[PDB]
């Protein structure tokens, strides 16, 4: 039933693929080279996200056990604890943040089924990847753009699934830095600097912010309400951009790639007073993003976890 997990490689070798200062114009060769270099990591991430999707779909214990088995194996292997191997940038470090987000959300989805010895393998592994990730943001030079929000989501998810307050606190701080970056006009200055991908990077900064408030909701906290619902200025800026890129074109130094809004809409439409603004985006799913915990359509409908 449960296939043999792939080996866990202790190192990540990722490749940056933007040619401009604005981090907006893709070199096709470097992108493919990145794709082939991360393919095992992407496959693993997809696989645990999918098996945890199945657990939530119908309660099948065999799905949870297989998800847990896959996570235990990469824990036992010390996967991604090795050197983050730079090539042209910190793409490897970004990859470990996204990989934590995937594996930590996968774990959280199936935690109810985890036996004491599975928790003792998996918990310490998530906790070191989480700390390893944070340590990168201690350097005062690294601007805390959308990547800091992606860092936060897995640090928070790990904090929640492993019951480590240090990492819950550090998650919360990432989220709140994000909410307080949201200008009066719903823009984020560090994302506005991303030329033709400025609108894409607002969608990409909002997603982990929404999933972090969704985790806060698992603890019965409402973080959507931070700063008199400041998050709703970003959501409105993004859902309107996806319909019409004109505001972004007028406020950036390049013509925007048009946006299909990502699966954060599945959650936001259910929280939001007036979800109808999300009808077109919702029609373009289902939304699968292992990075954000797998099947966002399933998790918005049925919850991120089966038993509180």
Residue numbers in the entry: 22 to 329
Question: Please, what does the article write about this entry?
Answer:
To gain insight into this possibility, we analyzed the statistical distribution of B-factors in different apo structures at pH 5.0, 7.0, and 9.0, which were solved at comparable resolutions of 2.63, 2.20, and 2.45 Å, respectively. The protein is least flexible at acidic pH, most flexible at neutral pH, and has intermediate flexibility at basic pH. In particular, Smlt1473 has maximum activity for polyGlcA at pH 7.0 as well as the greatest spread in activity with regards to pH (>75% of maximum specific activity retained between pH 5.5 and pH 8.0) and also the largest observed B-factor. However, significant rotameric transitions of important substrate-binding residues such as K42, K162, R163, H221, and R312L have been observed at different pH values. At the entry site, the residues involved in rotameric transition are H221 and R312, of which H221 has an altered orientation in all structures above pH 5.0, whereas R312 has an altered orientation only in the pH 7.0 structure due to a hydrogen bonding interaction with Y225. This generalization implicates the pH 7.0 apo structure catalytic tunnel to be the most flexible and rationalizes the less numerous and weaker interactions for the ManA cocrystallized pH 7.0 structure compared with pH 5.0, as discussed in the previous section.
To decode the pH-driven multiple substrate specificities and selectivity in this single enzyme, we present the X-ray structures of Smlt1473 determined at multiple pH values in apo and mannuronate-bound states as well as the tetra-hyaluronate-docked structure. The structure is composed of 13 α-helical segments (α-1 to α-13) connected by 14 loops (L-1 to L-14) and two β-strands (β-1 and β-2) (Fig. 2, B and C (i and ii)).
